[PDB]
């Protein structure tokens, strides 16, 4: 037999890391000092802090302490010390604060000239970098300046004010600086949101630069766009002369206010001034395509489609790819992981270490262990090829670490492997529990996916707790409503009845919408509704222009995510740009 046998080999490498590895007894002796070395830096105990590291595994626990004790060092002038131990990082495994106090004790400023278009906060060691390039010289005046009134805008004025006097011009200088620090009258926290704040700045504006009425205007517009005031935020992003001094942020909310009142050719204008690293973005090659769709630039169009869909796994490529004909693919294009592949990766000496503290925060139920083994996790496949991410991502897999699993596989550009990108554990309980209120369970697992990545412990900063990330407070008025105790919130099951009950209620006040019930489960529903327009809005559109960054991100990752589970459960295909839809008005 037989013509249907006739089918070709395909394989993923075998080669795999080998690493010295240590016992069991030596990681866990290592994390069992861990968190007193942390503490050792912050009491400035360098003693204690070499102690540790001297006899400390090749580990991620090695490097967090080492780059927290550099960081200490870069702050208190050690540089000999700085020095010897800076050279003991991979250089990946450097943050970027021990990299900026690393060339500013060279009195190397290479850095400065990207690192000064950043308009928000840095850490202190990058700071005090462009403070010292800006002393020297060795700054762009424009980047400088912008910078400075970045800080301004941001409620960074101490920081603010050192550059300002760096560049030889302080706040109490009587000359540009002190005219600077004056315009926090109009670019103030509150101020901007003064219903004076436009009347102030149009009558001193004769009396400003170009570049200090352009930057003015675009803090006023921002305000304006992020509180949906569509109108208003055009007018007064529309007397913005020189849009390259706005901030990045400023420079996306006047695209997204022109989004929002479908202005396609004011659109596709504002993204021709923003930074080329934001024209490249998946939002921004989308948008641009949606305008030159609309204004009859056909051609054009499905250029920057294909360029989007190029992106990868992510909301605006799923939809570029629409515009295209294309619709979401999730067979893999790589074979599985071998086996034998799969069992030498968790040989590898910095592999072993992390799934030796996962397997202990899983017994000891021992959640700071657990964090820790997935920053293992991470410095163990730093570096991996494809072939290698896709072997330890089954290996993670296999141990039961969900979200390493998805870490690894996400990490590929070109070998996909859909479901550990889009895994999918516990359906014994979470489509039982999306069925009993009538919701898809494809959304259910993107929102999953989101907000926990399968690890049933998570509990964000703010308390929200579980696979489905609800908040304490809500766990209490669910349980009241449905007859549950409160404390269900802790377990996996009850998180899961929980979560998807909490969907199905917010979808229902949310005039039974998906999008804005996605938006209401991130920021609730009272501001879910004050996001509607009074006007109909398409879905991607409602979603671009959440005021809140974390739930804007929040709704696309989930949506995007939902598009991916449902071709992987055969349900019948809905286009994402169909399960978007329309947002009604209110």
Not at 204 to 218: I, N
Not at 233 to 244: F, I, N, S, T
Not at 268 to 284: D, F, G, N, R
Not at 568 to 576: D, E, K, M
Request: hydrophobic share 40%.
């Amino acid at each position: 037999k037989t013509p249907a046998d006739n089918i070709e080999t395909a394989d993923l490498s075998a080669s795999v890391p080998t690493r010295p590895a240590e016992p069991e007894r030596k990681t866990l002796a290592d994390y069992g000092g861990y968190p007193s070395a942390l503490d050792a830096v912050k009491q400035k105990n360098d003693a204690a802090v070499a102690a540790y590291l001297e006899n400390a595994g090749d580990s991620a626990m090695a490097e967090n302490v080492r780059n927290e004790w550099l960081k200490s060092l870069g702050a208190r002038r050690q540089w000999t010390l700085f020095a010897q131990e800076y050279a003991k990082l991979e250089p990946a495994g450097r943050a970027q604060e021990v990299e900026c106090y690393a060339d500013s004790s060279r009195n190397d400023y290479t850095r400065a000239a990207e690192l000064v278009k950043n308009t928000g906060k840095l850490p202190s060691g990058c700071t005090k970098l462009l403070e010292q390039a800006a002393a020297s010289g060795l700054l762009d005046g424009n980047d400088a300046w912008r910078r400075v009134r970045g800080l301004l805008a941001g409620r960074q004025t101490t920081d603010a004010r050192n550059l300002a006097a760096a560049l030889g011009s302080p706040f109490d200088g009587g000359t540009q600086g002190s005219r600077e620090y004056a315009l926090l009258n109009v670019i103030g926290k509150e101020a901007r949101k003064s219903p004076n704040a436009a009347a102030l700045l149009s009558e001193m504006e004769s009396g400003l630069s170009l570049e200090q009425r352009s930057f003015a205007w675009g803090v006023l517009g921002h305000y304006q766009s992020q509180n949906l005031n569509v109108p208003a935020a055009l007018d007064y992003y529309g007397k913005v002369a020189d849009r390259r001094q706005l901030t990045d942020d400023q420079i996306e909310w006047y695209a997204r206010a022109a989004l929002r009142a479908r202005r396609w050719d004011e659109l596709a204008s504002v993204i021709s001034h923003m930074p080329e690293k934001l024209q490249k973005s998946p939002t921004w090659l989308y948008w641009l395509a949606r305008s030159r769709a609309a204004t009859g630039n056909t051609q054009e169009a499905e250029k920057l489609y294909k360029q989007a869909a190029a992106t990868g796994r992510n909301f605006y490529a799923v939809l570029a790819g629409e515009e295209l004909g294309r619709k979401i693919d999730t067979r893999n294009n790589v074979p599985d992981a071998g086996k034998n592949s799969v069992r030498r990766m968790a040989e590898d000496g910095a592999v072993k270490r992390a799934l030796v503290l996962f397997q202990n925060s899983q017994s000891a139920g021992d959640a700071k262990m657990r964090r820790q083994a997935q920053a293992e996790w991470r410095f163990a496949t730093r570096g991996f090829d494809e072939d290698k991410l896709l072997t330890a991502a089954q290996t993670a897999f296999d141990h039961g670490f969900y979200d390493m699993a998805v870490n690894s596989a996400e990490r590929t550009d070109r070998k996909l492997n859909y479901t550990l990108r889009y895994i999918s554990p516990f359906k014994d309980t979470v489509i039982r529990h999306a069925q009993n209120v009538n919701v898809d369970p494809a959304w259910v697992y993107g929102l999953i996916r989101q907000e926990s990545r399968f690890v049933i412990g998570a509990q964000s900063r703010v308390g929200a707790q579980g696979l489905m990330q609800v908040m304490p407070a809500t766990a209490r008025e669910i349980a009241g409503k449905i007859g549950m105790d409160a404390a269900q919130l802790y377990t996996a099951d009850g998180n899961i009845r929980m979560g998807t009950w909490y969907m199905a209620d917010t979808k229902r006040r949310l005039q039974n919408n998906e999008v804005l019930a996605t938006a209401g489960y991130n920021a609730g529903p009272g501001r879910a509704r004050r996001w509607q327009a009074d006007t109909p809005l398409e879905g991607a559109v409602y979603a671009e222009t959440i005021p809140f960054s974390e739930t804007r991100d929040y709704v696309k990752k989930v949506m995007a995510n939902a598009a991916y589970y449902a071709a992987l459960f055969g349900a019948p295909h809905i286009p994402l740009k169909q399960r978007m839809g329309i947002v009604p008005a209110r």
